[PDB]
Amino acid sequence: MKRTWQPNRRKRAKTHGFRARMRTPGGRKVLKRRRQKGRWRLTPAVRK
Amino acid sequence: AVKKFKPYTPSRRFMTVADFSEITKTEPEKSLVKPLKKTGGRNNQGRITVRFRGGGHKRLYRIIDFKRWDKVGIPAKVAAIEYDPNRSARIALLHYVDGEKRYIIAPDGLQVGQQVVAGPDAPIQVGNALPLRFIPVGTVVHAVELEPKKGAKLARAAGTSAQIQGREGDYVILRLPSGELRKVHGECYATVGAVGNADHKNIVLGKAGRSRWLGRRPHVRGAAMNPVDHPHGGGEGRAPRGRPPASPWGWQTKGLKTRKRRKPSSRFIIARRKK
RNA sequence: CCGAGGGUAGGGCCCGUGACUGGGGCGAAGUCGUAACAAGGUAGCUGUACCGGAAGGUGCGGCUGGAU
RNA sequence: UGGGAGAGGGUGGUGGAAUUCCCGGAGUAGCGGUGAAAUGCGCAGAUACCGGGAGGAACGCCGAUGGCGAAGGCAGCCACCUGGUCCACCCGUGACGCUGAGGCGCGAAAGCGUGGGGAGCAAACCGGAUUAGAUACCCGGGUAGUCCACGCCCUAAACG
RNA sequence: CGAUGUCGGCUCGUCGCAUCCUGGGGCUGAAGAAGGUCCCAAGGGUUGGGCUGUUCGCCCAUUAAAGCGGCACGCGAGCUG
RNA sequence: GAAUGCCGGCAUGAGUAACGAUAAAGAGGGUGAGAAUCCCUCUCGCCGUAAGCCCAAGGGUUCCUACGCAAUGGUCGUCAGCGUAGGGUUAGGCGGGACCUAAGGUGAAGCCGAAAGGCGUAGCCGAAGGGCAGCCGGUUAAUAUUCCGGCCCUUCCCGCAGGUGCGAUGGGGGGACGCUCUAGGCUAGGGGGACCGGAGCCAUGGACGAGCCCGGCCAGAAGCGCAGGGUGGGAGGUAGGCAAAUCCGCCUCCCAACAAGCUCUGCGUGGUGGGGAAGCCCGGGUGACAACCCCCCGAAGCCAGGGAGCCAAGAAAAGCCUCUAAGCACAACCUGCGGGAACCCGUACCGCAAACCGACACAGGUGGGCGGGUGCAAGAGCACUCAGGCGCGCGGGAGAACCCUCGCCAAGGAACUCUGCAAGUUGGCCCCGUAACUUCGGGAGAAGGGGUGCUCCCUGGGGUGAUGAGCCCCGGGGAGCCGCAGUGAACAGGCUCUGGCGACUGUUUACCAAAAACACAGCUCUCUGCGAACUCGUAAGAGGAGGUAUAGGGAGCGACGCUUGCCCGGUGCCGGAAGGUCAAGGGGAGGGGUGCAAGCCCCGAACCGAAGCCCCGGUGAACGGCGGCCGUAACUAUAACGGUCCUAAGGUAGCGAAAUUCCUUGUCGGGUAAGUUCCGACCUGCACGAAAAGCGUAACGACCGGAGCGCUGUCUCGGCGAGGGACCCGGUGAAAUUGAACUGGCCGUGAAGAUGCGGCCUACCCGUGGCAGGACGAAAAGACCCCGUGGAGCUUUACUGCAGCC
RNA sequence: GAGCUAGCCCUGGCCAGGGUGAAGCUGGGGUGAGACCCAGUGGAGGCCCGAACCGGUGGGGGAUGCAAACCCCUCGGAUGA
Ligand SMILES: CC[C@H]1OC(=O)[C@H](C)[C@@H](O[C@H]2C[C@@](C)(OC)[C@@H](O)[C@H](C)O2)[C@H](C)[C@@H](O[C@@H]2O[C@H](C)C[C@H](N(C)C)[C@H]2O)[C@](C)(O)C[C@@H](C)[C@@H]2N[C@@H](COCCOC)O[C@H]([C@H]2C)[C@]1(C)O
Ligand SMILES: [K+]
Ligand SMILES: [Mg+2]
Ligand SMILES: [Mg+2]
Ligand SMILES: [Mg+2]
Ligand SMILES: [Mg+2]
Ligand SMILES: [Mg+2]
Ligand SMILES: [Mg+2]
Ligand SMILES: [Mg+2]
Ligand SMILES: [Mg+2]
Ligand SMILES: [Mg+2]
Ligand SMILES: [Mg+2]
Ligand SMILES: [Mg+2]
Ligand SMILES: [Mg+2]
Ligand SMILES: [Mg+2]
Ligand SMILES: [Mg+2]
Ligand SMILES: [Mg+2]
Ligand SMILES: [Mg+2]
Ligand SMILES: [Mg+2]
Ligand SMILES: [Mg+2]
Ligand SMILES: [Mg+2]
Ligand SMILES: [Mg+2]
Ligand SMILES: [Mg+2]
Ligand SMILES: [Mg+2]
Ligand SMILES: [Mg+2]
Ligand SMILES: [Mg+2]
Ligand SMILES: [Mg+2]
Ligand SMILES: [Mg+2]
Ligand SMILES: [Mg+2]
Ligand SMILES: [Mg+2]
Ligand SMILES: [Mg+2]
Ligand SMILES: [Mg+2]
Ligand SMILES: [Mg+2]
Ligand SMILES: [Mg+2]
Ligand SMILES: [Mg+2]
Ligand SMILES: [Mg+2]
Ligand SMILES: [Mg+2]
Ligand SMILES: [Mg+2]
Ligand SMILES: [Mg+2]
Ligand SMILES: [Mg+2]
Ligand SMILES: [Mg+2]
Ligand SMILES: [Mg+2]
Ligand SMILES: [Mg+2]
Ligand SMILES: [Mg+2]
Ligand SMILES: [Mg+2]
Ligand SMILES: [Mg+2]
Ligand SMILES: [Mg+2]
Ligand SMILES: [Mg+2]
Ligand SMILES: [Mg+2]
Ligand SMILES: [Mg+2]
Ligand SMILES: [Mg+2]
Ligand SMILES: [Mg+2]
Ligand SMILES: [Mg+2]
Ligand SMILES: [Mg+2]
Ligand SMILES: [Mg+2]
Ligand SMILES: [Mg+2]
Ligand SMILES: [Mg+2]
Ligand SMILES: [Mg+2]
Ligand SMILES: [Mg+2]
Ligand SMILES: [Mg+2]
Ligand SMILES: [Mg+2]
Ligand SMILES: [Mg+2]
Ligand SMILES: [Mg+2]
Ligand SMILES: [Mg+2]
Ligand SMILES: [Mg+2]
Ligand SMILES: [Mg+2]
Ligand SMILES: [Mg+2]
Ligand SMILES: [Mg+2]
Ligand SMILES: [Mg+2]
Ligand SMILES: [Mg+2]
Ligand SMILES: [Mg+2]
Ligand SMILES: [Mg+2]
Ligand SMILES: [Mg+2]
Ligand SMILES: [Mg+2]
Ligand SMILES: [Mg+2]
Ligand SMILES: [Mg+2]
Ligand SMILES: [Mg+2]
Ligand SMILES: [Mg+2]
Ligand SMILES: [Mg+2]
Ligand SMILES: [Mg+2]
Ligand SMILES: [Mg+2]
Ligand SMILES: [Mg+2]
Ligand SMILES: [Mg+2]
Ligand SMILES: [Mg+2]
Ligand SMILES: [Mg+2]
Ligand SMILES: [Mg+2]
Ligand SMILES: [Mg+2]
Ligand SMILES: [Mg+2]
Ligand SMILES: [Mg+2]
Ligand SMILES: [Mg+2]
Ligand SMILES: [Mg+2]
Ligand SMILES: [Mg+2]
Ligand SMILES: [Mg+2]
Ligand SMILES: [Mg+2]
Ligand SMILES: [Mg+2]
Ligand SMILES: [Mg+2]
Ligand SMILES: [Mg+2]
Ligand SMILES: [Mg+2]
Ligand SMILES: [Mg+2]
Ligand SMILES: [Mg+2]
Ligand SMILES: [Mg+2]
Ligand SMILES: [Mg+2]
Ligand SMILES: [Mg+2]
Ligand SMILES: [Mg+2]
Ligand SMILES: [Mg+2]
Ligand SMILES: [Mg+2]
Ligand SMILES: [Mg+2]
Ligand SMILES: [Mg+2]
Ligand SMILES: [Mg+2]
Ligand SMILES: [Mg+2]
Ligand SMILES: [Mg+2]
Ligand SMILES: [Mg+2]
Ligand SMILES: [Mg+2]
Ligand SMILES: [Mg+2]
Ligand SMILES: [Mg+2]
Ligand SMILES: [Mg+2]
Ligand SMILES: [Mg+2]
Ligand SMILES: [Mg+2]
Ligand SMILES: [Mg+2]
Ligand SMILES: [Mg+2]
Ligand SMILES: [Mg+2]
Ligand SMILES: [Mg+2]
Ligand SMILES: [Mg+2]
Ligand SMILES: [Mg+2]
Ligand SMILES: [Mg+2]
Ligand SMILES: [Mg+2]
Ligand SMILES: [Mg+2]
Ligand SMILES: [Mg+2]
Ligand SMILES: [Mg+2]
Ligand SMILES: [Mg+2]
Ligand SMILES: [Mg+2]
Ligand SMILES: [Mg+2]
Ligand SMILES: [Mg+2]
Ligand SMILES: [Mg+2]
Ligand SMILES: [Mg+2]
Ligand SMILES: [Mg+2]
Ligand SMILES: [Mg+2]
Ligand SMILES: [Mg+2]
Ligand SMILES: [Mg+2]
Ligand SMILES: [Mg+2]
Ligand SMILES: [Mg+2]
Ligand SMILES: [Mg+2]
Ligand SMILES: [Mg+2]
Ligand SMILES: [Mg+2]
Ligand SMILES: [Mg+2]
Ligand SMILES: [Mg+2]
Ligand SMILES: [Mg+2]
Ligand SMILES: [Mg+2]
Ligand SMILES: [Mg+2]
Ligand SMILES: [Mg+2]
Ligand SMILES: [Mg+2]
Ligand SMILES: [Mg+2]
Ligand SMILES: [Mg+2]
Ligand SMILES: [Mg+2]
Ligand SMILES: [Mg+2]
Ligand SMILES: [Mg+2]
Ligand SMILES: [Mg+2]
Ligand SMILES: [Mg+2]
Ligand SMILES: [Mg+2]
Ligand SMILES: [Mg+2]
Ligand SMILES: [Mg+2]
Ligand SMILES: [Mg+2]
Ligand SMILES: [Mg+2]
Ligand SMILES: [Mg+2]
Ligand SMILES: [Mg+2]
Ligand SMILES: [Mg+2]
Ligand SMILES: [Mg+2]
Ligand SMILES: [Mg+2]
Ligand SMILES: [Mg+2]
Ligand SMILES: [Mg+2]
Ligand SMILES: [Mg+2]
Ligand SMILES: [Mg+2]
Ligand SMILES: [Mg+2]
Ligand SMILES: [Mg+2]
Ligand SMILES: [Mg+2]
Ligand SMILES: [Mg+2]
Ligand SMILES: [Mg+2]
Ligand SMILES: [Mg+2]
Ligand SMILES: [Mg+2]
Ligand SMILES: [Mg+2]
Ligand SMILES: [Mg+2]
Ligand SMILES: [Mg+2]
Ligand SMILES: [Mg+2]
Ligand SMILES: [Mg+2]
Ligand SMILES: [Mg+2]
Ligand SMILES: [Mg+2]
Ligand SMILES: [Mg+2]
Ligand SMILES: [Mg+2]
Ligand SMILES: [Mg+2]
Ligand SMILES: [Mg+2]
Ligand SMILES: [Mg+2]
Ligand SMILES: [Mg+2]
Ligand SMILES: [Mg+2]
Ligand SMILES: [Mg+2]
Ligand SMILES: [Mg+2]
Ligand SMILES: [Mg+2]
Ligand SMILES: [Mg+2]
Ligand SMILES: [Mg+2]
Ligand SMILES: [Mg+2]
Ligand SMILES: [Mg+2]
Ligand SMILES: [Mg+2]
Ligand SMILES: [Mg+2]
Ligand SMILES: [Mg+2]
Ligand SMILES: [Mg+2]
Ligand SMILES: [Mg+2]
Ligand SMILES: [Mg+2]
Ligand SMILES: [Mg+2]
Ligand SMILES: [Mg+2]
Ligand SMILES: [Mg+2]
Ligand SMILES: [Mg+2]
Ligand SMILES: [Mg+2]
Ligand SMILES: [Mg+2]
Ligand SMILES: [Mg+2]
Ligand SMILES: [Mg+2]
Ligand SMILES: [Mg+2]
Ligand SMILES: [Mg+2]
Ligand SMILES: [Mg+2]
Ligand SMILES: [Mg+2]
Ligand SMILES: [Mg+2]
Ligand SMILES: [Mg+2]
Ligand SMILES: [Mg+2]
Ligand SMILES: [Mg+2]
Ligand SMILES: [Mg+2]
Ligand SMILES: [Mg+2]
Ligand SMILES: [Mg+2]
Ligand SMILES: [Mg+2]
Ligand SMILES: [Mg+2]
Ligand SMILES: [Mg+2]
Ligand SMILES: [Mg+2]
Ligand SMILES: [Mg+2]
Ligand SMILES: [Mg+2]
Ligand SMILES: [Mg+2]
Ligand SMILES: [Mg+2]
Ligand SMILES: [Mg+2]
Ligand SMILES: [Mg+2]
Ligand SMILES: [Mg+2]
Ligand SMILES: [Mg+2]
Ligand SMILES: [Mg+2]
Ligand SMILES: [Mg+2]
Ligand SMILES: [Mg+2]
Ligand SMILES: [Mg+2]
Ligand SMILES: [Mg+2]
Ligand SMILES: [Mg+2]
Ligand SMILES: [Mg+2]
Ligand SMILES: [Mg+2]
Ligand SMILES: [Mg+2]
Ligand SMILES: [Mg+2]
Ligand SMILES: [Mg+2]
């Protein structure tokens, strides 16, 4: 049956993307944390 | 008025539709329509704030002239009478001798090809708009402003009408369609006549889908819900109300008056509505 | 081929009968009241409507086949 | 052809008296109701009185033993639309008449449907009284209904 | 109670005997026939239906008879639900 | 040494289950160390509204080639979507951007919020919507509307000619719109041809034929033709379109009107450029100078912004045209022609799937377009089949139980069972015929029947065309033929009577409930006079609604019919300017502390003083409630009647052993041979009853009872058969579970159900196919139950508080 | 976190074929005029049969599955809420 992951590049970028993160105070703290943790990517890859 | 159907389906047996007799033009004036943003009952927070709304036919809003006192003295001809999906009344197309075209709600009896006009010197004739001050007492009237220049507020529903009971200083005493006796300022405009389409209330929607077409989603009874959802929720098998009948939000819904006590307009209501 | 009739299926009319049920008629001396006949003690009758243990009552309209 | 009388019918408009409510005034200890009362309303100011307003229904005198209509029925006043009818002249058509099974229409009140409207009245119902009882008569309330429109119902001591 | 699946049916049996039938017998208020009652006896047998989830029971039609009970109210790592 | 401990390793089950749709395979020839598995050939089978093809998501090199086989591949592997390397994606016209706007988002102005932030007009962003210029063929191992060829076209810049009051983010037109039904003419696509082109073919009894087999086209500018769309012309006035306006709107007059003209598309033709089969020989060459024509069918596509009807009344903005404004009229724009200029990103490949979403090369899920032929009434249904694609990445055998899916069955025909569960039966079309009841539509495909193929003859009507032939489409009658059977295969209702519930079509517990539950039109109560009530929000602001009592909120009830009775004492709600109580505050009789005093300071009685509560009323489609005992009739029995106690009032109509009846399988009647169910009655209704509606109701129902006919393997009662498994052999090889085990029966005993203790009895060692009685077998630290001063959801006249309201 | 699911908003798209035959309209009859009746035309509907598509009724299978909801047979809707 129809599973939960229905990938959509526009949706992915507009939901979790770098610009989405920077708009909101909670989103910038995500980026802040993920740098502090040293994540190799702060944001989901989406090939546009 | 009100056409019936033969019972060739379960729903046609009771469904009735308007006769549409008075309608003379079947497409709106392109200069006078604008797109209506369907809300679905949601507000700017995106939240349902009026329940059970949505999914009805697409409509275009016809710009209606609820002032009429901005073209004082300029007569107009009744060019067409048309369907309006945004209200129960029919609307009338006016061709002002200005060349300006405007919409008004059609009063009962207004015949296409007649003249109308607005102003203190206007004939007390169906479709003319005057300040309430200048309309003779006892005249039935509609599209009545509540405060001067703020726009027609009272009696614009199909078949409605206020009546002029008397005059008291700068204020005329109106009998609103509710039966309430209110003082309205004499400078407030009003159109002599009753609103047309008085057979509107004798329409039988006939089936559930007809309500869906009107943007009316199904209404679910409090009694059919659970206590998380409603005062009337829960119970094993069916249950009576078991408390004074209440809304989803807890307030009582049988008798509990809700008009604000200290409202400044109470000075202007003489007698609350009838029956 | 037609053809008595036999068979399958579905209808219509009539008759008998049926737990139970509806009123009707009749029945020397039952129970409740007293509606009608006198102005019958609320003039009567009436079509209708609603009500009431019961006769009845009441409303609306009609009739005199109503006493003074 | 010329005339006449009429609550004949339909549509709309409108006039006063009265009842009820509501506002204002003035006023006080009761009012109302009956056979007599009680219920009821009333010092939270009723009743009685004056002014103001709202609303509905019915039209006093004229009015009669009267008039009109086929019957049921019809009554303030006005306008429009419209039926029947009588009389005079003796002008026209020349038996074109009578009745009438079916049919069609009209048909008081009550009643029904859908809207309105709702003052007074009042089935139901409530209360007071009476009474052995009183699901009655009498009294205080009171809802349909009574009124309008449209559609039904088609009954009658629809009787001379 | 860090789980012993709980009615009944179906299937499959097996056992006890306080024996329903069939075999043997005493007493009879046993003429015969057919019964009653008790004793010995568990080898075998002990029907098909209507009703109800039913066990049981009532009923139909038979029968030599239409027995009672145990096996975790036998049997759900066998089925049913 | 134990923690259902943690991490890791390795065992057991076990050479066991399985190896992922039962669409299916066989041989020959290659390659290679090695082949059921790779390549080629022939044969066989499967999909063909797909299991083919083309897009869009998503995926991201998986594409092509060479060289490889450790691992990945459920076996194998020489192969591969795997490893290594190299190669491959080309655009002014296709898509997106340099254009437009939609919801929404963001947001100069502005508003709001402790902070963070929330709003918000214009503007901006935002697409699979609007707008916009490329068609056919060829070429590569791999890209092509992109390269190449042919023939077209767009925009920008500059120039030239002609023309004009030019000029816009401003005005105006237009763009610009629904649903169903639908006309004419075309095109796509398709069928046929005795005509045209083609390498061949004559088999096995016949055919050298009007034979068989194959094909008989595509694109194309101007022009022309056919079919459509769109569109009045002129003048005068003018106060509206937030400046102006010669435009648009309005008025008047003349002219033209169902045309025409102008204009725009579609289609046909069209200079020209392409394509071109079977077969044969080795993707190619020949076929070939291929031919390229006639008839018919024909869209849901095109003309298109067509037409008609209907109500639920059907985006925006730009491009575009027009109007003028500043400014400019040596400019500028329009038209034509010419030269120049024309950027960024996508382009491989998979794409109903082995490349996407499902941990897997997973029987699941995934939007749009094309989807041929024949027949079956139609069709995208069904069977077969084209193009094209596949045989599903373990095989070989065997022919046990048993299981799955399937076929048949004597006699009986529901006897099966909770239940006809299941499976039979019926089944399409044409025609005949069709009941109660009914809201007059229905019920209805009721029920029940007859027909159905092929041949020959005669004949009616339509479409095309020419009125004819031919082709195609509906039919009518007559005579025959064959079989068990003619919708001969495949797809395609079993029916009836009667109850309950719900009117109905709908909706629901994604993943155990589809229902009688929810919704529903409709009825009633109630709130709301508009800055409405109500809702969300601290707010601003939203929704309500650009609505206004024929409207909007809330509640119940639930089409419809006939109806909905009595109780207002209690709770609620509504009304009540009196009275009573009542907080802060006003008041300050009278006190108190302190100081020498002036004073400073504290307490404080009466009295005035809101809502609320008390109090007086109203109110049931508001919460709710609607009695007991005893007696009484000329047979008995019963009690119309009476007595009395209580209540706010004592359940009315209707209905009743009921989805409600405990006793209960009530009693009686019906149906049956037999009926705890069913149906119909009765009424001592444990414990119906009137909008938590009462009683009915045609029609509807994958709802739930009961009955009957039909027909059956459900059953008496089982038998045989088929295939996929199970079994054997080769390859690969899990799992839960597991204290260790050298793991028998009985009768006992034991913590009360013993392989393990006692006494007896029985038993050589080890397997394989099977069955499930036990190992209190496995699984999940019992959901029940209790306990815990553990938790959570829910309620209220529990407590306490908060929002909100007063 | 609404790429699952639930509702709403915007913009698109999809629903083979067949059946039934409402209003209206036309003609005719009827009448004082009507109502109305008859035929034809017409093509209405939370109308009917049935693919796609949407479902998930009953049964069987599956149950360390092909699958953490699947498969087969059967069944509901299919111009509409
Ligand atoms: C399909 C396979 C699943 O098993 C089942 O569904 C069984 C039918 C399931 O039983 C159903 C059917 C049932 C009718 O009983 C047969 C019902 O009583 C129980 C409650 O549930 C097992 C027996 C059922 O177990 C029975 O459960 C009841 C409660 C107690 C029984 N105990 C008595 C033996 C026990 O046998 C369980 C609970 O389902 C088995 C359990 C181990 C798992 N349960 C589920 C998940 O639930 C776990 C517990 O949280 C809910 O999944 C189970 C087990 C993993 C299985 C095995 O996967
Ligand atoms: K329990
Ligand atoms: Mg899903
Ligand atoms: Mg996942
Ligand atoms: Mg998605
Ligand atoms: Mg995307
Ligand atoms: Mg996208
Ligand atoms: Mg998205
Ligand atoms: Mg983003
Ligand atoms: Mg976001
Ligand atoms: Mg890095
Ligand atoms: Mg992130
Ligand atoms: Mg109707
Ligand atoms: Mg009718
Ligand atoms: Mg109208
Ligand atoms: Mg516009
Ligand atoms: Mg809005
Ligand atoms: Mg917004
Ligand atoms: Mg938001
Ligand atoms: Mg709300
Ligand atoms: Mg809503
Ligand atoms: Mg309105
Ligand atoms: Mg309207
Ligand atoms: Mg005012
Ligand atoms: Mg209505
Ligand atoms: Mg609407
Ligand atoms: Mg509604
Ligand atoms: Mg609704
Ligand atoms: Mg509801
Ligand atoms: Mg509930
Ligand atoms: Mg519930
Ligand atoms: Mg919640
Ligand atoms: Mg709560
Ligand atoms: Mg609550
Ligand atoms: Mg409750
Ligand atoms: Mg409940
Ligand atoms: Mg209950
Ligand atoms: Mg409930
Ligand atoms: Mg209660
Ligand atoms: Mg409450
Ligand atoms: Mg009011
Ligand atoms: Mg014989
Ligand atoms: Mg007697
Ligand atoms: Mg009398
Ligand atoms: Mg008497
Ligand atoms: Mg008397
Ligand atoms: Mg009397
Ligand atoms: Mg008398
Ligand atoms: Mg009595
Ligand atoms: Mg009475
Ligand atoms: Mg009379
Ligand atoms: Mg007093
Ligand atoms: Mg006083
Ligand atoms: Mg009044
Ligand atoms: Mg008089
Ligand atoms: Mg007289
Ligand atoms: Mg004469
Ligand atoms: Mg009458
Ligand atoms: Mg008389
Ligand atoms: Mg236990
Ligand atoms: Mg355990
Ligand atoms: Mg366990
Ligand atoms: Mg013996
Ligand atoms: Mg013997
Ligand atoms: Mg024996
Ligand atoms: Mg037992
Ligand atoms: Mg029993
Ligand atoms: Mg036993
Ligand atoms: Mg025992
Ligand atoms: Mg046990
Ligand atoms: Mg026991
Ligand atoms: Mg027991
Ligand atoms: Mg047991
Ligand atoms: Mg089991
Ligand atoms: Mg069992
Ligand atoms: Mg077992
Ligand atoms: Mg230890
Ligand atoms: Mg463990
Ligand atoms: Mg542990
Ligand atoms: Mg561990
Ligand atoms: Mg570990
Ligand atoms: Mg290690
Ligand atoms: Mg480990
Ligand atoms: Mg290991
Ligand atoms: Mg091993
Ligand atoms: Mg084993
Ligand atoms: Mg396995
Ligand atoms: Mg498998
Ligand atoms: Mg298959
Ligand atoms: Mg072979
Ligand atoms: Mg082979
Ligand atoms: Mg090699
Ligand atoms: Mg190999
Ligand atoms: Mg090999
Ligand atoms: Mg090969
Ligand atoms: Mg991937
Ligand atoms: Mg390998
Ligand atoms: Mg190798
Ligand atoms: Mg290998
Ligand atoms: Mg290597
Ligand atoms: Mg491998
Ligand atoms: Mg695999
Ligand atoms: Mg490539
Ligand atoms: Mg180009
Ligand atoms: Mg640029
Ligand atoms: Mg911050
Ligand atoms: Mg901010
Ligand atoms: Mg954006
Ligand atoms: Mg954009
Ligand atoms: Mg776009
Ligand atoms: Mg383009
Ligand atoms: Mg082109
Ligand atoms: Mg020009
Ligand atoms: Mg210009
Ligand atoms: Mg412009
Ligand atoms: Mg528009
Ligand atoms: Mg559009
Ligand atoms: Mg529509
Ligand atoms: Mg073409
Ligand atoms: Mg064809
Ligand atoms: Mg002007
Ligand atoms: Mg050549
Ligand atoms: Mg289409
Ligand atoms: Mg078009
Ligand atoms: Mg816009
Ligand atoms: Mg110059
Ligand atoms: Mg650029
Ligand atoms: Mg490409
Ligand atoms: Mg698929
Ligand atoms: Mg597809
Ligand atoms: Mg693939
Ligand atoms: Mg998975
Ligand atoms: Mg595979
Ligand atoms: Mg073909
Ligand atoms: Mg067919
Ligand atoms: Mg295969
Ligand atoms: Mg397959
Ligand atoms: Mg063998
Ligand atoms: Mg074998
Ligand atoms: Mg199969
Ligand atoms: Mg056979
Ligand atoms: Mg048989
Ligand atoms: Mg039978
Ligand atoms: Mg039979
Ligand atoms: Mg049976
Ligand atoms: Mg059996
Ligand atoms: Mg069952
Ligand atoms: Mg069939
Ligand atoms: Mg019939
Ligand atoms: Mg019958
Ligand atoms: Mg019947
Ligand atoms: Mg019936
Ligand atoms: Mg009928
Ligand atoms: Mg039939
Ligand atoms: Mg024949
Ligand atoms: Mg033949
Ligand atoms: Mg069928
Ligand atoms: Mg239901
Ligand atoms: Mg239903
Ligand atoms: Mg009903
Ligand atoms: Mg209903
Ligand atoms: Mg439906
Ligand atoms: Mg479920
Ligand atoms: Mg759940
Ligand atoms: Mg679940
Ligand atoms: Mg779930
Ligand atoms: Mg299920
Ligand atoms: Mg359920
Ligand atoms: Mg269902
Ligand atoms: Mg539900
Ligand atoms: Mg409901
Ligand atoms: Mg319903
Ligand atoms: Mg109703
Ligand atoms: Mg109402
Ligand atoms: Mg709030
Ligand atoms: Mg708004
Ligand atoms: Mg009825
Ligand atoms: Mg009360
Ligand atoms: Mg009271
Ligand atoms: Mg009360
Ligand atoms: Mg209560
Ligand atoms: Mg009470
Ligand atoms: Mg009654
Ligand atoms: Mg019973
Ligand atoms: Mg009973
Ligand atoms: Mg009984
Ligand atoms: Mg009952
Ligand atoms: Mg029940
Ligand atoms: Mg009961
Ligand atoms: Mg019982
Ligand atoms: Mg019995
Ligand atoms: Mg019987
Ligand atoms: Mg009894
Ligand atoms: Mg209730
Ligand atoms: Mg109830
Ligand atoms: Mg009730
Ligand atoms: Mg019925
Ligand atoms: Mg019915
Ligand atoms: Mg249903
Ligand atoms: Mg159902
Ligand atoms: Mg069998
Ligand atoms: Mg086999
Ligand atoms: Mg061997
Ligand atoms: Mg091996
Ligand atoms: Mg392996
Ligand atoms: Mg050991
Ligand atoms: Mg050992
Ligand atoms: Mg042993
Ligand atoms: Mg013991
Ligand atoms: Mg033992
Ligand atoms: Mg032992
Ligand atoms: Mg031991
Ligand atoms: Mg030992
Ligand atoms: Mg020892
Ligand atoms: Mg031992
Ligand atoms: Mg021993
Ligand atoms: Mg032994
Ligand atoms: Mg074995
Ligand atoms: Mg075992
Ligand atoms: Mg065991
Ligand atoms: Mg154990
Ligand atoms: Mg065990
Ligand atoms: Mg066991
Ligand atoms: Mg635990
Ligand atoms: Mg435990
Ligand atoms: Mg547990
Ligand atoms: Mg529980
Ligand atoms: Mg316990
Ligand atoms: Mg405690
Ligand atoms: Mg404790
Ligand atoms: Mg606790
Ligand atoms: Mg919880
Ligand atoms: Mg709690
Ligand atoms: Mg707080
Ligand atoms: Mg409130
Ligand atoms: Mg999305
Ligand atoms: Mg469809
Ligand atoms: Mg269809
Ligand atoms: Mg048909
Ligand atoms: Mg027809
Ligand atoms: Mg028409
Ligand atoms: Mg139908
Ligand atoms: Mg049919
Ligand atoms: Mg299923
Ligand atoms: Mg089945
Ligand atoms: Mg499962
Ligand atoms: Mg499936
Ligand atoms: Mg259907």
For residue B165, report the phi and psi dihedrals to the nearest 5 degrees: -85, -30
Residue B111, both tokens = 């015949």
* Amino acid residing at B43: N
- State the Cα–Cα distance between residues B83 and B90, nearest whole angstrom: 5
Measured CA to C1', the nucleotide nearest B271 is D22
Sign of CA dihedral A24, A25, A26, A30: positive
Total length of chain A: 48
Quickly count: other Cβ atoms within 10 Å of residue B215's Cβ: 18
Residue given tokens 């008056």 in the structure block: B257
Give me the phi and psi of B199, to 5 degrees please: -80, 5
Q: Which two tokens stand for residue A33?
A: 């944390």
**Residues in CB range of B151: below 8 A, 6 or more apart:** B66, B67, B145
Give the whole-angstrom CA distance, residue B101 versus residue B155: 23
Both tokens of B269, joined, read 């209501």
- Asked whether the beta carbons of B127 and B114 are under 8 A apart, the reply is yes
Burial class (CB in 10 A: 0-12, 13-18, 19+), B143: buried
Q: Which ligand lies nearest the alpha carbon of B260? A: 235
Q: How far apart are CA B241 and CA B149, in angstroms?
A: 47
8 Å CB contact between B41 and B74: no
Distance, CA A3 to ligand 121 centroid (Å)? 67
Helix/strand/coil for B246: strand
Q: Detail the DSSP E strand segments found in chain B.
A: 3-4, 16-17, 33-35, 60-62, 76-82, 91-96, 101-105, 115-116, 129-131, 140-142, 144-145, 152-154, 162-168, 171-175, 181-185, 189-192, 269-271
Q: Which nucleotides of D are covered by protein (CB under 7 A)?
A: 53-55, 114-115, 118
Residues forming a β-bridge with B91: B82, B105
Residue written as token pair 């409603």? B230
Amino acid type, B238 = R
DSSP state of B108: T
Question: Which residues in range 135-154 of chain B are in contact with strand F, contact meaning CB within 7 A of any of its atoms?
Answer: 146-147, 150-151, 153-154
CA distance A26 to A21: 8
- Calculate the CA dihedral of residues B92, B61, B207, B223 and round it to 10 degrees: -120
The residues pairing with B164 across neighbouring beta strands, listed in sequence order, are B174
Per-chain residues with Cβ under 5 A from ion ligand 13: B 4-5
Query: Near ion ligand 36, which residues have CB within 5 Å?
Result: B 235, 239
Residues 6+ apart with CB under 8 A from B106: B22, B81, B89, B90, B91, B92, B195, B196, B197
Q: What is the DSSP letter of A17?
A: S
Cα-to-chain-centroid distance, residue B217: 20
Contact (CB, 8 A) for B156 and B142? yes
As separate numbers, helices (DSSP H) first and strands (DSSP E) second, chain A gives: 3, 0
Of B106, B131, B121, nearest in space to B25 by CA: B106
Task: Show which positions of strand G are touched by protein (CB under 7 A).
Answer: 1-5, 7-11, 22-23, 44-47, 69-70, 80-81
